[PDB]
Every structure is written in C-alpha cells, then in structure tokens.
Design a binder for these strands. Structure first.
Ligand code: NA
Ligand code: NA
Ligand SMILES: [Zn+2]
Ligand SMILES: [Zn+2]
Ligand SMILES: [Zn+2]
Ligand SMILES: [Zn+2]
Lengths: 162, 162
DNA sequence: TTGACTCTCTTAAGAGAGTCA
DNA sequence: TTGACTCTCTTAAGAGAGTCA
C-alpha cells in the first residue's frame, strides 16, 4: 500500500501541475445582492491537459501516477482528499465544487462530502444570502431562485384537501 | 387521448380513484421552527392499487385507460398536468412532490416543473424559513441543513488563491 | 511510465414500454 | 378491458477500469 509520505507526494505533484493551469477570474453572486470574485484553475478543453491527467468523459478526468512499477489512478478532483475518510454516515464522499465550475481543479474551490450535500449546494442562497452549510459556500448556487414552475397544485373536483 | 374532453375525463377518473386512497396525516417542518400538517393520499404498498394503476418500479407507478379501443398510459403523477406544456425552456416537465412522499398522489401536493426545480426543493428552507419558490413549498426540504462535510477546501503548498 | 483515448457505473429526483393472464 | 408483473431510460451532480504504443 502507498505510504502517507507517498500519498503526500502524489498530492504535491498534483498541486504543482494544477497550479500551472490557466487561472480564470470569475465574478459571481454571493447572495444578498452582493458580487464577489473566484479564481478558477481550469483544465484545458482538449489534450494535452497536464502531466498525469487524462479525460475519461466529456467533463470527467483522472490523475495517474506510477509508483514502484504499479499504476495508481484517481478521479481528478479527489486527489486533495486522499488522506481523508472516504465515507460518512454510510455515504460515499465525493469531490464537490464550491465554485460550480467542473473544469476547475483549484483545491480551494473543492470540498469532500456526500453526493446529496454536493448536489444541494446548487440551490444555496450563498455566503451572503443565508448559507447554513457548516463548510460555507463560496457563492450562491447557480440554480437558486424562484424557479420556472409551469403548473402548481390543483384539482378539478373536491376530492382532496391539502 | 387526443381530445380535450377525453383528457378531462382521464383527469376526472384519476382524481376519483386517488381520492379513495388512504389519507395519511404527516406533520412536517415548515422552517422557522414551525410545524404544519399535510394530508397525503397514498397509493397502496402492494396490489391491488386502484382502478387503472399498476407498479412499474419500487416507487414508480403508471395510470392506464382504454380510449377508442387503444390503451393510453402515463406516469401515475403526471395525470393532473396533461393539459399543460410538457416542456419549459427546452427542459422536460416533471411531476414534483411538494410533500416529498413518493406514494402520495394528492394533486394538491404536486407541481409541474423542470427536474432541476424539482430536485432543488429537497434543500429548501421551507415556507416559514425563506422559501423563494414562486410556486411555494409546502414544507422544508428533507435535506436542508448544515450538511456533514468531511473535509473543506485546503492546499499543502502556496500555488492557489480563492 | 506515460498519454490519449475507450468503456461502463452511482445516486435519487424523475420517465417510457413489453409480457402474460 | 383490466390487472400484475417485467425490463430499460433521463438528468446532472459524481465515479472505476481497459487498451495500445
Ligand atoms: Na457540485
Ligand atoms: Na421532488
Ligand atoms: Zn473554481
Ligand atoms: Zn451553502
Ligand atoms: Zn402528499
Ligand atoms: Zn421552496
């Protein structure tokens, strides 16, 4: 098994490589009508992506390192969390984009949480709009708002009460 | 079926049948430390379910009627909305449980909206906790709260900024 | 050891359609 | 005509693993 020092070396090489990705400044809603700025380190749209990186899906990548003749591979956003527990409350931990920008690999824009917690950030009002996430959101979720509901609750007869 | 009259007849028959499902009272969080009461009309756990109804999955059902010698079939929660547009902004409209109770078929607990709007209600603070849904939530979403994040954003080196 | 592709799978909110009696 | 089963698919947040040079 890879030692702690070996895993730290993997994290360090990943950080070195991602830190050289193009850094894109994005202005974002924070909630409460306030605007903020995030700096995303974006993996390229097409090969080459960076040392150790390869695309396994339209917006999925993996990081690969060969250590003592054995190939090891991880989801590209999971690397910052290799020294953390990988489940909680019986749920698998997932890399969760606080910046909501899939190509971004900035570890300051990632957290490690259940898929439900991850998804729920899409609708959060944001750090200046009432976010209650213990690990606070960096921005208002892209899907926060009144929604676009086509039809509400309704009945034709009188068979139902709310 | 094609005609408006035929569609209204399908809606009326569905309402009459669902109107005879057992009515189960559920006390629910509203947000803001308040609680409310919902009356769900719950499809049975096992066959028979009711005239026109059959189970296609663990928590999936369909409603079917024979019109002009042809069988017409719909997802069991879609029937109230047969006269509504079936898409919005190029996204499929879905039946969305305001009561977060799959077996419930009370149309006063359903709306018709994109899958993203639908999902997002799981994390809404609720009608007394800040819900901004234009078609208002009936309860706080079951997944609202601080979450259980295992690890937050972090870096080992000095290559990244927020 | 490395790059650039290939494939299928998970989850939990939702769907459509066929086989028998 | 109606009932009771069977199967796979959609979405958008996420995954593991194979092949070739
Ligand atoms: Na996310
Ligand atoms: Na829902
Ligand atoms: Zn980012
Ligand atoms: Zn938040
Ligand atoms: Zn209900
Ligand atoms: Zn709401």
């Amino acid at each position: 098994a890879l030692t702690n020092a070996q895993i730290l070396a993997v994290i360090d090489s990943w950080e070195e490589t991602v830190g050289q990705f193009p850094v894109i400044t994005h202005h974002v809603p924070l909630g409460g009508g306030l605007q903020g700025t995030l700096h995303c380190y974006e993996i390229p749209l097409a090969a080459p992506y960076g040392v150790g990186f390869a695309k396994n899906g339209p917006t999925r990548w993996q990081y690969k390192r060969t250590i003592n003749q054995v190939v090891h591979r991880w989801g590209s956003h999971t690397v910052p969390f290799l020294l953390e527990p990988d489940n909680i409350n019986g749920k698998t931990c997932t890399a969760s984009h606080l910046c909501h920008n899939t190509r971004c690999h900035n570890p300051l824009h990632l957290c490690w949480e259940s898929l439900d917690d991850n998804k729920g950030r899409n609708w959060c009002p944001g750090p200046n709009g009432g976010c209650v996430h213990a690990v606070v959101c960096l921005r208002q979720g892209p899907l926060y708002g009144p929604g676009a509901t086509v039809a509400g609750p309704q009945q034709r007869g009188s068979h139902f009460v709310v």
